Amino acid sequence: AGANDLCQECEDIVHLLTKMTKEDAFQEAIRKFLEQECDILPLELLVPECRQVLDVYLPLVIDYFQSQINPKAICNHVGLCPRGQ
Amino acid sequence: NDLCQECEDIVHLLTKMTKEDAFQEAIRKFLEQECDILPLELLVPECRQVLDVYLPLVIDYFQSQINPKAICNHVGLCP
Ligand SMILES: CCCCCC/C=C/CCCCCCCC(=O)OC[C@H](COP(=O)(O)OCCN)OC(=O)CCCCCCC/C=C/CCCCCCCC
Numbered sequence: 001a002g003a004n005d006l007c008q009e010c011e012d013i014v015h016l017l018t019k020m021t022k023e024d025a026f027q028e029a030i031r032k033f034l035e036q037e038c039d040i041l042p043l044e045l046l047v048p049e050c051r052q053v054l055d056v057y058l059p060l061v062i063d064y065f066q067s068q069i070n071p072k073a074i075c076n077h078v079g080l081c082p083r084g085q
Numbered sequence: 086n087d088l089c090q091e092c093e094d095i096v097h098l099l100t101k102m103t104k105e106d107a108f109q110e111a112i113r114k115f116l117e118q119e120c121d122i123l124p125l126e127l128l129v130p131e132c133r134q135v136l137d138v139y140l141p142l143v144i145d146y147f148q149s150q151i152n153p154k155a156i157c158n159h160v161g162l163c164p
C-alpha cells in the first residue's frame with residue numbers, strides 16, 4: 001500500500017516543482033542556499049568546483065521542470081512506477 | 086503560488102516516501118547506475134562511496150523528528 005503510492009507521491013513532488021520553478025524567487029532562494037553550501041563542508045569536497053557545477057546545472061534543472069512537456073516521466077525513470085506513470 | 090506551503094508539501098511527501106523500503110531500493114539502483122556514467126561519475130568523485138554514505142543518512146533524516154517550516158526557512162522559501 002505504501003509502496004504502490006510511491007509513483008503518485010513522486011509525481012506530486014514533480015508537479016510541485018513545476019509550479020515552484022515558475023517563481024524566480026524560487027530560483028534565487030535555491031541558488032543562494034546552494035552557493036552557501038558549496039562553500040562549506042562536506043559539499044565543498046564532495047563536489048569539486050561546486051560553485052561552477054551549480055552555475056551550470058541549476059539553470060538546466062530549473063529549465064527542465066519549467067519547459068518539459070512531461071517531467072513526471074522522471075518518476076518512471078527512477079524506478080518508482082512499476083505500472084507506468 | 087505559496088512557495089512556503091509548496092516546500093512544506095514536498096517535505097511531507099518525502100517523509101512518506103522514505104518510509105518505504107522500495108523507495109530506497111529504486112533510488113539506490115538508479116543512482117548506482119548514474120554514478121558509473123557521465124555526468125555524475127565526474128561531478129562526484131568516488132560517487133558510489135558517496136552514495137553509500139549519504140543515501141541512508143538522508144532517508145533516516147526524513148524519518149526523524151524534523152521541523153518542515155524551519156527546513157523550508159533554511160532554504161529560503163518560508164519567512
Ligand atoms: C549533506 C548532504 C549532501 C548530499 C549531496 C551529495 C551529492 C550531491 C550531488 C549533486 C550534484 C549533481 C548534479 C547533477 C544534475 C544533472 O546532471 O542534471 C542534468 C539533467 C539533464 O539536463 P540536459 O538539459 O539534458 O543536459 C545536461 C548535460 N547534457 O537535468 C535534468 O534533466 C533535470 C533533472 C535533475 C533533477 C535533480 C534533482 C533535484 C530534485 C530534488 C528533490 C528533493 C531531494 C531532497 C534533497 C535532500 C537533501 C538533504
Ligand SMILES: CCCCCC/C=C\CCCCCCCC(=O)OC[C@H](COP(=O)(O)OCCN)OC(=O)CCCCCCC/C=C\CCCCCCCC
Pocket residue numbers: 030034037043047050053054057058061092095096151152156159160
Ligand atoms: C537542497 C536541495 C534543493 C532541491 C530543491 C528544493 C525544493 C523543495 C524543498 C525540499 C526540502 C528538502 C531539502 C531540505 C533539507 C536541508 O538541507 O535542510 C536541513 C539541513 C540541515 O540539517 P541538520 O542541521 O544537520 O539537522 C537539524 C536541522 N534539520 O540542511 C543542510 O545543511 C543540508 C544541505 C545538503 C545539500 C544538498 C545538496 C543539493 C543536492 C542536489 C541539488 C541539485 C541541483 C543542481 C545543482 C547542483 C549543486 C551542487
Ligand SMILES: CCCCCC/C=C\CCCCCCCC(=O)OC[C@H](COP(=O)(O)OCCN)OC(=O)CCCCCCC/C=C\CCCCCCCC
Pocket residue numbers: 010013014074077078112116119120123124125129132133135136139140143
Ligand atoms: C527531481 C526529483 C523528483 C523525484 C523526487 C523523488 C525523491 C528523491 C529523488 C532523488 C534522486 C534525483 C532524481 C533524478 C533525476 C533524473 O531522473 O534525471 C535524470 C538525468 C537526465 O534527465 P532525463 O530527463 O531523465 O533525460 C534527459 C533527456 N531529456 O540524468 C542524471 O544525470 C541524473 C543525476 C541525478 C543526480 C541527483 C543527486 C541527488 C542528490 C542527493 C541524493 C541523496 C544523497 C545521495 C547522493 C549520491 C549522489 C552520488
